[PDB]
Design a protein around this ligand. Structure first.
Ligand code: CLA
Ligand code: CLA
Ligand code: CLA
Ligand code: CLA
Ligand code: CLA
Ligand code: CLA
Ligand code: CLA
Ligand SMILES: CCCCCCCCCCCCCCCC(=O)OC[C@H](COP(=O)(O)OC[C@@H](O)CO)OC(=O)CCCCCCCCCCCCCCC
Ligand SMILES: CC1=C(/C=C/C(C)=C/C=C/C(C)=C/C=C/C=C(C)/C=C/C=C(C)/C=C/C2=C(C)CCCC2(C)C)C(C)(C)CCC1
Ligand SMILES: CC1=C(C/C=C(\C)CCC[C@H](C)CCC[C@H](C)CCCC(C)C)C(=O)c2ccccc2C1=O
Ligand SMILES: CC1=C(C/C=C(\C)CCC[C@H](C)CCC[C@H](C)CCCC(C)C)C(=O)c2ccccc2C1=O
Ligand code: SF4
Ligand code: SF4
Ligand code: SF4
Ligand SMILES: [Ca+2]
Ligand SMILES: [Ca+2]
Lengths: 80, 31, 152, 148, 453, 147, 138, 39, 152, 39
């Protein structure tokens, strides 16, 4: 399965969560920024590796990082 | 002189030893 | 360490030797068709028969009484065919006398039905192997020209 | 999962055809393998180096053996400017008669390849004169590869 | 007669005086037990989407340009065109290239329609809905027919190359080996020469001399003569069918899968022109309809290049040439097509190597510009592969260092230099590839047929 | 390396033939390289087999064409990229799973397109093999038909 | 579980479920529409969404979320639930897992795979030689 | 295609061995190895 | 109504069409020896192999390198036998890799034992079919005289 | 038994088809259908 890590430069704009096509990320409470929320990736088993979440991230550098790894049925996006 | 049949057979039989030696090396490198 | 008790059992009448218990010999023997796991008995028999019937006719073809004639391949074939007939009679008689007792739910070659399937497979494969060896030996001029490309 | 590849469980659990392909391209990257320590890394590189040396030795042995067996080394000594060095014979059953006649060259009776390695000139400059010298070179490299 | 039938045909549609048809009524009328509601909704589709009209009109204009190319050579409609071999070759080749480009563009705007102007509410159980609902069957069967055609045409060619190199000419697919005679084309050729007194009684001559007749000899040269079709023509016709089928496969895969796929279920939200959806799902580069147009451009290039190569060699070998005063035809390449156009080596030797002698010996003469454009078009085609084989990440990282060197000398521009986008890199590569290859063939063709024809 | 070996071979063809003026006159423009080196010296390699028979250069003609084929097959992997081929393979998987008498046979590994790095490598390997085999065929046959 | 719902009026497509559904896993999306309307299936084509409760079986989670994102959400249907169904028949609720959409911050959620540093404050590959350590390790 | 070299019957058998029999055996054994669904 | 969801399932990846679902095609496919109910796998393989082996040697007989010679049927038969040997090897290797998992109480052809029976039946049927095709081709003079009444 | 009429090989195949193959097929299919012991 792919690995999705959220770094503490996350400003809680929720844009990575909205861009995820497979519902990997969610917004959880976190007192580390003004928005009061951080991205989380509890469902990286459903991560396909598309990196739409990194594309949506406005921080420099990325507060969300996808590391592509071992490939499963789910991560390779197979309908068969 | 041109090679004889026995020299070709001897070359085959002698090269049969690096066969098992390469097989043993590949088996030990697989482990 | 090289020679040890067979399967770790000191009192079994065997020694675990690199002829008898090494990995290469074990996988080669266990993947012979009589031991290859998952096979139906008839396919085990077919492969065993092919391998045996292919080489049986050869001794008579090159060394039999018809070897110095026009019909050496035919004599070797007739000899191999009837020797396979005796071999199959031996196999079916062994199956008839050896499994009139109860049946094991494990290996199929230790039951009467599985041994009869093995016997049928052996007969078919051995007659096929004997005939294909005869056919190649008789048409050896054609095979020879094919491998040299004389027909091109 | 599967057994193949033994060195990578990440590829071993891959249910696609990629499991084969990536394994072939990650078989010699020993540092990325599972359970690899530095000691086993250096020892495996050592053993692979010897296996490669033996492959090199068998390759030179093959060139020498085919020149001694199917080549024209001695006839090439007697006329090095106008004889063509023969690499090995040709056995292609799909040949027609015209290709058999065309590749029957360099004074041979059967189809042969004309050697362009320059091995004949190198062996002629370093003292080899008969097919026996080439044959002894072949067997000596055949046991040197065994030593490797 | 064209005028009369076209003024007639401009009276079928109802406009202002209650006479004619509403085309909606025609379309919605036409439906069947296989195709659901049939053509209901296609009137709204074709009256609201400019792209749905551009697709059809580009496809028909490309097909008609191809028709024009294949019609103006065998019946040259202008005086002393048939004996103007440069003009014949150039006009055929030009209209084929324009036709292939416009056909690819029709496929492009079909995909654009599907991603942008497809409304499923209009297209409920009509022909459009149901082709979307079995696109997998369509594309898989087109895939199979493409593989079948590729093997049983090009594999025949390399079988012939191998048999010839073996010294086995009797084992070849040739007129002297294993014959593949194009019997159906031959009988249709027969039917057109038995028609100027038969099935077209009120007519003096046939439609064209290509179907049969005798060598029209205007000036010293052949105007047109019967074009015999044999094993070689069978082979190259099936090569054309294969290349057309693969071009259709790519373009129809782009059109039918522009909205969604099993891999990407939301391609409509991504759009027509997008590079990928990331290295995930194994890697999703070139899923867009734009990228299928990008690949179909190369395959159109392959198809049209083989078509014009077939035309050039077949005309120079079996049609064009010089008629002697006694009345024998000395063809330009002397009929090498029937025995050399059956191997790839024959195409490389007797067409590409042999007929490019004029385009490379052109230096110092009036055709030297054609040799210069031959070399320059080789250059542009090879320039394309830098854009085609690379990606923009490398170029951005390199532009970073050149930006550093500009920043040291206080000359880094305010408009930030960036590598071209992924789609733009593909577009530049395919544009230079098409330009380079097409201009290479153009310079070759014109130098050959002007120096010799 | 192609530039290196093209230069070496053309200069040495001029030197071995004694016609050094061929190189020393036509290597200054690039039409000389295409005409007087590539077009000329292919002439006997290309006629390795023909409609009239076969020479001993027939294997070099076949390998010349073979190398052109491998080199162009690499262009497929280098130009067309993955998601097209994955979408094609999904339709092929559908066609296999819905075809009678082939439903009995199932793949053990799920068919997928080549990875991005993988097909970069495969296209590069085809490009390299075609490059090397084409130039080797040309070099040996153009230097073996004369001397 | 026991996922209920009328299927939408769909003529079927060659792009639907395959043997992975009956052997490995499939997915379902359930929702409620107020009306018979038209939407586009991810397996291509137009479908008629029924009054009340609709249930759709799809082959991937991404197809269920694509239908939810491009069809249900613009039509103001935000009650959809996505399930994973195993070949035996066991059913796991997936997308609105806590009942709150993941784009909305919800108490009780714990941060998973968060890193308490910036990205290039990750260690070097060289220092993280033979061990289980990855440079993105917490 | 029958050389004057020593033991000329050896390509006759060895070319089908190295070209057909050995690739069939190696391909089959590697097929049985790479598709073993063991632990 | 001709084209509908396959088995009434609108979400299945198939379309019930008069090619994929019509009764003539359905019963013809179901009554093929692969799908025919009540056939043990050995007879399925026998019939399948008979049909495949019978037509397999034809391409080499009329098109192979020996087609312009006295031994055309011979070369066709040899090539067909070798191709059938590779086909039987492919079937048996598929059965070894595919069914090493546990067994189903459903189809016998999705079982290692059943696929092995099918493989053996395929081998015997295919070798037999290739040989009888060669035999009829090699004695086409005799067959032709039989139908022409040249022996009456 | 060989006529001057066109395609004279056609009786050679068709008489065994109409008299052996088609009858065996028809009786076998009808025997399966009339002995079909379903409802
Ligand atoms: C008249 C009846 C009859 C006929 C025509 C056959 C015919 C045949 N038997 Mg058979 N057999 C029979 C009765 C018969 N059997 C009986 C009653 C028994 C139980 C004792 C057997 C036990 C038997 C075995 C174990 C085998 C055969 C086999 C065979 C085949 C090989 C040829 C042969 O053995 O010699 C021809 C036989 C005769 C001319 C008549 C002698 C019959 C006596 C009673 C039995 C002798 C069997 C002997 C041990 C072998 C052949 C087609 C072999 C085979 O290939 O199996 C598939 C073999 O494996 N038979
Ligand atoms: C002594 C020389 C040497 C050694 C020991 C290595 C060793 C290594 N290299 Mg390296 N390399 C070398 C030279 C060497 N290389 C050269 C000369 C090049 C330039 C081409 C490269 C470029 C290179 C790259 C880019 C990479 C490596 C990588 C690696 C590591 C893993 C290799 C692997 O598993 O994949 C094995 C490779 C294969 C299985 C591919 C086989 C290629 C075949 C033989 C090509 C032949 C084509 C075709 C079959 C020919 C048929 C012709 C016929 C049809 C006529 C390994 C430690 C990889 C790595 O791990 O990076 C971290 C890596 O990415 N190498
Ligand atoms: C259909 C086309 C065709 C085919 C099939 C062949 C086949 C052959 N030719 Mg050939 N040839 C052809 C066309 C063809 N030719 C033409 C048209 C000509 C011009 C007339 C020639 C001229 C010619 C000459 C001059 C020679 C041949 C020779 C040969 C034989 C090579 C023996 C060998 O070592 O194989 C083995 C193949 C290899 C070692 C290379 C394959 C390596 C692959 C690409 C990569 C493998 C690496 C990978 C890790 C391993 C995969 C697993 C594997 C173990 C299963 C072989 C039988 C030679 C011969 O007669 O043998 C002595 C000989 O020198 N041919
Ligand atoms: C010369 C280079 C080359 C070759 C050989 C191919 C070949 C192919 N392309 Mg392709 N392509 C190329 C360049 C090439 N392309 C380039 C440069 C691009 C960039 C835009 C593309 C983009 C492209 C797309 C987008 C598509 C293709 C498709 C195809 C396949 C067409 C189906 C077919 O013909 O079946 C048969 C295959 C051949 C005729 C290839 C020659 C093989 C010979 C005749 C047989 C070999 C004998 C035997 C197998 C040898 C066994 C040896 C053994 C030891 C391994 C085919 C395999 C289409 C496809 O997938 O179709 C279904 C597809 O949609 N191509
Ligand atoms: C390693 C170098 C080498 C090479 C490239 C060749 C190549 C060839 N040999 Mg030769 N051979 C070699 C070594 C070599 N040989 C040695 C050292 C001997 C003495 C035992 C022989 C004995 C021999 C005979 C009797 C014949 C050939 C023949 C042939 C030709 C046909 C292919 C074949 O049947 O091989 C057959 C190979 C053997 C019979 C012996 C194989 C032993 C070598 C050392 C194995 C090398 C394996 C290699 C290192 C593994 C790397 C694989 C790679 C993919 C990673 C072919 C040109 C045939 C011929 O002459 O064609 C006309 C022929 O009949 N060879
Ligand atoms: C020395 C032992 C031995 C012998 C004499 C045979 C003989 C035979 N085998 Mg066999 N096989 C063996 C060991 C052996 N096998 C082992 C250890 C395995 C498991 C890896 C297999 C798996 C196997 C399969 C799947 C099949 C055969 C088949 C066959 C027959 C076809 C000819 C042939 O394969 O080439 C001759 C073989 C040799 C000269 C020895 C090579 C042995 C290698 C190591 C294994 C070959 C496997 C490969 C897929 C074939 C033949 C009678 C085919 C058949 O039709 O059976 C009914 C076939 O379907 N074998
Ligand atoms: C219905 C009238 C009719 C009758 C009584 C016959 C009778 C005969 N034909 Mg025939 N035939 C017919 C129509 C008929 N034909 C038509 C319309 C064609 C054109 C396709 C042919 C083409 C044809 C060929 C090529 C041959 C014959 C031959 C023969 C002779 C051998 C039997 C055979 O193989 O037939 C073969 C049957 C066909 C090829 C198809 C027949 C097509 C008709 C329409 C089917 C009739 C079905 C019938 C009406 C259903 C009623 C069945 C009843 C029990 C309820 C036989 C005397 C053979 C011959 O000449 O022997 C010397 C020969 O080879 N025929
Ligand atoms: C094709 C002849 C034809 O049109 O068949 C008939 C059928 C459609 O016929 P219909 O009677 O439904 O046509 C009526 C309307 O579609 C036309 O107004 O075509 C198909 O469904 C596709 C057939 C697969 C094509 C495979 C290639
Ligand atoms: C490897 C090895 C070895 C060896 C082994 C051997 C000894 C071998 C072999 C072998 C053999 C011994 C083989 C065989 C075979 C066979 C076959 C391949 C067969 C066949 C057959 C057929 C093909 C048949 C057919 C048929 C039928 C069934 C019916 C009809 C008729 C006919 C005839 C068609 C050694 C010692 C080193 C060690 C161990 C391992
Ligand atoms: C070379 C290359 C580049 C670099 C190409 C660039 C940056 C194009 C820009 C080049 C021209 C020369 C820029 C011209 C700049 C000004 C317009 C110059 C002023 C012109 C006056 C002289 C009139 C990519 O960005 C790229 C991206 C994706 C895939 C492949 C490639 C690729 O191959
Ligand atoms: C054609 C093509 C495919 C399709 C190609 C596939 C699926 C490979 C299929 C190859 C078949 C299996 C035959 C391979 C034959 C080889 C010559 C065998 C060598 C294998 C060694 C291990 C021996 C891609 O998947 C792809 C992915 C990314 C970018 C470009 C492309 C691309 O261009
Ligand atoms: S897009 Fe980036 S900044 Fe916004 S919530 Fe996601 S990780 Fe944080
Ligand atoms: S890589 Fe794709 S699937 Fe994975 S978390 Fe990012 S957007 Fe979601
Ligand atoms: S290589 Fe380029 S096109 Fe392919 S997935 Fe990566 S960014 Fe997208
Ligand atoms: Ca005697
Ligand atoms: Ca022949």
């Amino acid at each position: 399965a792919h690995t999705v890590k959220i770094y503490d430069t996350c400003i809680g704009c929720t844009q990575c969560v909205r861009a995820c096509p497979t519902d990997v990320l969610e917004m959880v409470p976190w007192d580390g920024c003004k928005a009061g929320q951080i991205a989380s990736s509890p469902r990286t088993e459903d991560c396909v590796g598309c990196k739409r979440c990194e594309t949506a991230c406005p921080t420099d550098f990325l507060s969300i990082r996808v590391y592509l790894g071992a490939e499963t049925t789910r991560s390779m996006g197979l309908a068969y | 002189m041109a090679l004889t049949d026995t020299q070709v057979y001897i070359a085959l039989v002698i090269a049969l030893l690096p066969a098992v030696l390469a097989f043993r090396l590949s088996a030990e490198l697989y482990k | 360490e090289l020679v040890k008790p067979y399967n770790g059992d000191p009192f079994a009448g065997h020694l675990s030797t690199p002829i008898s218990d090494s990995g290469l010999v074990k996988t080669f023997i266990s993947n012979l068709p009589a031991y290859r796991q998952g096979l139906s008995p008839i396919l085990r028999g077919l492969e065993v028969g092919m391998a045996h019937g292919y080489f049986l006719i050869g001794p008579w073809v090159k060394l039999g009484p018809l070897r110095d004639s026009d019909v050496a391949n035919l004599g070797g074939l007739i000899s191999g065919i009837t020797l396979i007939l005796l071999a199959t009679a031996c196999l079916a008689a062994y199956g008839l006398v050896s499994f009139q007792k109860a049946s094991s739910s494990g290996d199929a070659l230790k039951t009467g039905e599985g041994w009869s399937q093995f016997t049928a497979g052996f007969f078919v494969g051995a007659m096929g192997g004997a005939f294909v060896a005869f056919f190649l030996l008789e048409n050896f001029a054609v095979v020879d020209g094919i491998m040299k490309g004389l027909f091109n | 999962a599967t057994k193949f590849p033994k060195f990578s469980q990440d590829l071993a659990q891959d249910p696609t055809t990629r499991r084969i392909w990536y394994a072939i391209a990650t078989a010699h990257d020993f540092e990325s393998h599972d359970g690899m320590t530095e000691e086993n890394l250096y020892q495996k590189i050592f053993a692979s180096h010897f296996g490669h040396l033996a492959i090199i030795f068998l390759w030179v042995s093959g060139s020498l053996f085919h020149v001694a067996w199917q080549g024209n080394f001695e006839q090439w000594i007697q006329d090095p400017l106008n004889t063509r060095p023969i690499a090995h014979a040709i056995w292609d059953p799909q040949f027609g008669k015209a290709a058999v006649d065309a590749f029957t060259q360099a004074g041979a009776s059967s189809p042969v390849d004309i050697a362009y390695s320059g091995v004949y000139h190198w062996w002629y400059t370093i003292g080899m004169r008969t097919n026996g010298d080439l044959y002894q070179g072949a067997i000596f490299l055949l046991v040197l590869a065994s030593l490797a | 007669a064209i005028a009369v039938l076209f003024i007639i045909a401009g009276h079928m549609y109802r406009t202002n005086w209650g006479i004619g048809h509403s085309l909606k009524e025609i379309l919605e009328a036409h439906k069947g037990p296989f195709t659901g509601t049939g053509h209901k909704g296609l009137y709204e589709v074709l009256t609201t989407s400019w792209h749905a009209q551009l697709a059809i009109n580009l496809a028909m204009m490309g097909s008609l340009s191809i028709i024009v190319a294949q019609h103006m050579y065998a019946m040259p409609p202008y005086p002393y065109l048939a004996t103007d071999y440069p003009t014949q070759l150039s006009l055929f080749t030009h209209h084929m290239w324009i036709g292939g480009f416009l056909i690819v563009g029709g496929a492009a705007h079909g995909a654009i329609f599907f991603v942008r102007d497809y409304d499923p509410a209009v297209n409920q159980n009509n022909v459009l809905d149901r082709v979307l609902r079995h696109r997998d069957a369509i594309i898989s069967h087109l895939n199979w027919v493409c593989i079948f055609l590729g093997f049983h045409s090009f594999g025949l060619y390399v079988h012939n190359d191998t048999m010839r190199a073996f010294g086995r000419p009797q084992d070849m697919f040739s007129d002297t080996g294993i014959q593949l005679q194009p019997v159906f084309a031959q009988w249709v050729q027969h039917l057109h020469t038995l028609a100027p007194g038969g099935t077209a009684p009120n007519a003096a001559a046939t439609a064209s001399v290509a179907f049969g007749g005798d060598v029209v000899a205007v000036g010293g040269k052949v105007a047109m003569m019967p074009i015999a079709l044999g094993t070689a023509d069978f082979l190259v016709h099936h090569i054309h069918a294969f290349t057309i089928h693969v071009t259709v496969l790519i373009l129809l895969k782009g059109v039918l899968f522009a909205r969604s796929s099993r891999l990407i279920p939301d391609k409509a939200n991504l759009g027509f022109r997008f590079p990928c959806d990331g290295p995930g799902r194994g890697g999703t580069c070139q899923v867009s309809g734009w990228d299928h147009v990008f690949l179909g451009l190369f395959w159109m290039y392959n198809c049209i290049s083989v078509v014009i190569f077939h035309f050039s060699w077949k005309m120079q070998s079996d049609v064009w040439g010089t008629v002697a005063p006694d009345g024998t035809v000395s063809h330009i390449t002397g009929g090498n097509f029937a025995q050399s156009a059956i191997t790839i080596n024959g195409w490389l030797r007797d067409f590409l190597w042999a007929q490019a002698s004029q385009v490379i010996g052109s230096y110092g003469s009036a055709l030297s510009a054609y040799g210069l454009l031959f070399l320059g078009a080789h250059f542009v085609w090879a320039f394309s592969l830098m854009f085609l084989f690379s990606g923009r990440g490398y170029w951005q990282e390199l532009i970073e260092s050149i930006v550093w060197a500009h920043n040291k000398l206080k000359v880094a521009p305010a408009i930030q230099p960036r590598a071209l986008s992924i789609i733009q890199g593909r577009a530049v590569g395919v544009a230079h590839y098409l330009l380079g290859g097409i201009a290479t063939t153009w310079a070759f063709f014109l130098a050959r047929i002007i120096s010799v024809g | 390396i192609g530039w290196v070996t093209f230069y070496w071979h053309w200069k040495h063809l001029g030197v071995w033939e004694g016609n050094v003026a061929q190189f020393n006159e036509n290597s200054t423009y690039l039409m000389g390289w295409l005409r007087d080196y590539l077009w000329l010296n292919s002439s006997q390699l290309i006629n390795g087999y023909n409609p009239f028979g076969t020479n001993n250069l027939s294997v070099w003609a076949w390998m010349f064409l073979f190398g052109h084929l491998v080199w162009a097959t690499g262009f497929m992997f280098l130009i067309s990229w993955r998601g097209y081929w994955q979408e094609l393979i999904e339709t092929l998987v559908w066609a296999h799973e819905r075809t009678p008498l082939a439903n009995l046979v199932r793949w053990k590994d799920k068919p997928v397109a080549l990875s991005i790095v993988q097909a970069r490598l495969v296209g590069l390997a085809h490009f390299s093999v075609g490059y090397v085999l084409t130039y080797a065929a040309f070099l040996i046959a153009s230097t073996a038909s004369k001397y | 579980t026991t996922l209920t719902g009328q299927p939408p009026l769909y003529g079927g497509s060659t792009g639907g479920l395959l043997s992975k559904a009956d052997i490995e896993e499939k997915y379902a999306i359930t929702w409620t529409s107020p009306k018979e309307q038209v939407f586009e299936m991810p397996t291509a084509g137009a479908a008629v969404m029924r009054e009340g409760e609709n249930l759709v079986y799809l082959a991937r989670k991404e197809q269920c979320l694509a239908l939810a994102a491009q069809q249900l959400r613009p039509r103001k249907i935000n009650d959809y639930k996505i399930y994973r169904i195993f070949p035996d028949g066991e059913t796991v609720l997936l997308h609105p897992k806590d009942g709150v959409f993941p784009e909305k911050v919800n108490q009780g959620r714990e941060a998973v795979n968060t890193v308490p540093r910036s990205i290039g404050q990750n260690p070097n590959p060289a220092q993280l030689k033979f061990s289980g350590k990855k440079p993105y390790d917490p | 295609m029958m050389g004057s070299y020593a033991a000329s019957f050896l390509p006759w058998i060895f070319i089908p061995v190295v070209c057909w029999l050995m690739p069939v055996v190696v391909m089959g054994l590697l097929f049985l190895y790479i598709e073993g669904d063991a632990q």
